[PDB]
From a paper:
Here we report near-atomic models built into cryo-EM structures of procapsid I, intermediate procapsid II which has partially released the SP, and the mature DNA-filled capsid from bacteriophage SPP1. The structures are T = 7 laevo icosahedra composed of 415 copies of the MCP gp13 (35.4 kDa), several hundred copies of SP gp11 (23.5 kDa) inside procapsids, 180 copies of gp12 in DNA-filled capsids, and a gp6-gp7 complex which forms the specialised portal vertex. The asymmetric units (ASUs) comprise seven SPP1 gp13 subunits: six in a hexon (subunits A to F) and one from the capsid penton (subunit G). Gp13 has the characteristic L-shape of capsid proteins of other tailed bacteriophages, with well-defined A and P domains, an extended N-terminus arm, and the E-loop.
Procapsid II is larger, more angular and has a much thinner shell than procapsid I, ranging between 2 and 2.7 nm. Procapsid II has bulky density for the SP attached to the capsid lattice interior only underneath the MCP five−fold vertices. The hexon becomes less skewed in procapsid II, more flat and expands to a size of 16.5 nm × 14.2 nm with the central opening getting slightly larger (~3.0 nm × 3.7 nm). The transition from procapsid I to procapsid II is induced by major structural rearrangements in the hexon subunits that become flattened resulting in expansion without major changes in the pentons. In procapsid I all MCP subunits are bound to the SP gp11 protein via the N-terminal helix α1* (Phe15-Leu26), positioned beneath the capsid shell and the N-terminus of the spine helix α3 from the same subunit. The N-terminus arm moves upwards by 60° and stretches out from the P domain towards the hexon periphery, protruding to the outer surface. The A and P domains of subunits F and G keep a similar conformation in the two procapsid states, correlating with maintenance of their attachment to the SP, while the E-loop moves outwards making the overall conformation more flat. Each N-arm of the MCP Ci subunit forms four contacts with the MCP D(i + 1) subunit from the neighbouring ASU in procapsid II.
Author numbering:
A (entry chain F), C (entry chain G): 2 to 324
B (entry chain A): 56 to 217
The structure:
């Protein structure tokens, strides 16, 4: 058909392009990390492959002073040690196309299919991490200091409960940046409050703002239902700075192959990456595997945290939607 | 029609002891149909020379603007075709009949957000005069006079109005 | 091992050779026209396809003659109504070899492999035809006036009943060209009439002839049986001049691939064409698919047509063999 950079498969000149555009286009960003610690490098790249390491830490000395008084002596004190974990995950999928369609629309090879696949993974992470918090951080007594709800049919989501939730970190404020928002909410928001369209990029328009924050319109969210048609939403609020990840490399990032007896040709991607909040430690219990983790069971149960209280940093409030 | 898109049905966990399989792509199944029209009209003659002018000229220099109202005449009809009698499009129509609600400040929001994630994919608002009268009584419709010089392209919320 | 214009697969210099040699070798011809309309090329070669575009019919006659005169209008040449459709079919197969060297593949790979393909791939054509044509008359009323029998206990198939069939073409007589047949008939012929081997070209060889016609012979034609152990034959008569067909092309008419663990290599052809009577429109009723169809389904039912009587042009008559 054409020069076919992918269909005659130049593996160079292509894969770096795809990865980078995948990074910039997707947002989030930021919010979350850019270029996390090389810790996740040593977990990602070869050599010393996964699964994940464990890294330690020394909590700070603490204790009372003692009465300094003669005719008595002192007693010394000690330090402790602690543990931390991460995970590693793998992904991939195919494409069933016929090169007739792929470069039918594609035509000029460079921008077309690359831009597409980029936009693809851009949504993929947005699905995976946003699923990663989901069960864990909500289900425990251990985080409850970070969850408050107005639910059970008195609460409005406006102008007050938002503030109080935003102060659920007592001393530490003004580290928070982005507000995760499902659509219908922000609908109820434009219906009432002052939510203020702010134009930064000159000249471009614009990312919406609530109060010195960046709200984020996001399609896929949790939602539940009770009887009596009453609804409940989640809408995480963090803008922490940050989560973390590092890209890492597989072998054969791009592969082109075809089948003689039928008529097809297909594509594959299969990228590695390492992402996890630091944040709670990860463990192994009562799960399948391994590795990588999962989706479902990579959420449903069994995480364990140690810091604790501050510098997590994420908070959730389930609120009912305004009448 | 030359449709295009990429995304499907994801995602899948890379592991040995399994194979990936592909996922099919929506093809060009979008379909349309050619239409064609026309007409013709005569004159008189002896009436032309007897009237003190020529009908043929005036009619012939009025021919151009005729086809506009035809084009509109098709389009309105046709859209009114898509949305009728189909539950398959129903997410795009919002019926405030049954005698409450005026078109102010809310049902407008319902419209502009009825596309859940995608907002500001809309620009101009179709309107009947008397309505925007009922708007300018209450509503905030704000006059940005920008094109030098023109009066005026009204605006409600980062939109245009026609 | 060899020059291997197929194994190292030069797409030039081959496919055209295939198609041409196919046209010369297999016949028919004529009978059926060569080089039909190129709107069919729009059917195979994109765009315009889909289910098969319609072919016009052309001749000059309107009601000749009309009275040259004065004080009288002539009135014009009018085109009677009509419409039709067709099918469009896609076929192919593969071929196997082995690594224990059945080879050679001589000094002319081109003509060797090419022609040896042309034999087969040309030969299936007429099988598809008769298979199909068995469908019009199969059991249908609207063609009844184009079928005739002298059969059921008296007919000789010689010199007269044939003249009846010669009436059966409604307007046009002595437009006959070819005669379908089955062998035993033309045996009885050799016993009776003058059916005459006639060298056509000087010197080139040669078409068996009834009367200035090219007879065609194949073993597959309907043969049914009443009680009393006697046989009934079909032997279509058309010699319309003609049916029609045109080609178009897919992508990759020639392909070469191999197997790894097992020891093999394979070839494939896969070309498309459009051929049918005109004749009847082709509709989708109680018929699987799609598209193309089948042999069986190309038999079963659902052919309805508009002319009616003339420019069909095919006639069948069932009769007893000489006794």
């Amino acid at each position: 058909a054409y020069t076919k950079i992918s269909d005659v498969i130049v593996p160079e000149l292509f894969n770096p392009y795809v990865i980078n555009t995948t990074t910039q286009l997707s947002a989030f960003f930021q919010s979350g990390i850019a270029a996390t610690d090389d810790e996740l490098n040593a977990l990602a790249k070869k050599a010393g492959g996964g699964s994940t390491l464990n890294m330690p830490y020394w909590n700070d000395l603490d204790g009372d002073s003692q009465v300094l008084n003669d005719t008595d002596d002192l007693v010394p004190q000690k330090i402790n040690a602690g543990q931390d974990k991460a995970v590693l995950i793998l992904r991939g999928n195919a494409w069933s196309s016929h090169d007739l369609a792929a470069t039918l629309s594609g035509s000029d090879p460079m921008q077309a299919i690359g831009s597409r696949v980029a936009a693809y993974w851009a949504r993929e992470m947005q699905k995976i991490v946003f699923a990663e918090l989901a069960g864990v951080f909500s289900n425990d007594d251990m985080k409850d200091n970070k969850l408050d709800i107005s639910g059970t049919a008195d609460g409005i989501y406006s102008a007050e409960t938002f503030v109080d939730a935003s102060y659920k970190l007592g001393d530490h404020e003004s580290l928070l940046t982005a507000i995760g928002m499902h659509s219908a909410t922000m609908a109820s928001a434009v219906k009432q409050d002052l939510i203020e369209f702010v134009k930064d990029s000159q000249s471009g328009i614009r990312f919406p703002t609530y109060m010195n924050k960046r709200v984020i319109v996001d399609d896929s969210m949790p939602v539940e239902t009770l009887e009596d048609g009453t609804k409940v939403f989640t809408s995480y609020l963090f803008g922490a700075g940050a989560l973390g990840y590092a890209e890492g490399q597989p072998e054969v990032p791009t592969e082109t192959a075809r089948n003689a007896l039928g008529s097809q040709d297909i594509l594959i991607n299969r990228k590695h990456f390492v992402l996890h909040p630091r944040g709670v430690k990860f463990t192994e219990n009562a799960m399948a595997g391994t590795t990588p983790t999962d989706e479902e069971l990579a959420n449903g149960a069994n995480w364990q945290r140690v810091y604790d209280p501050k510098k997590i940093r994420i908070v959730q409030f389930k609120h009912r939607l305004q009448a």
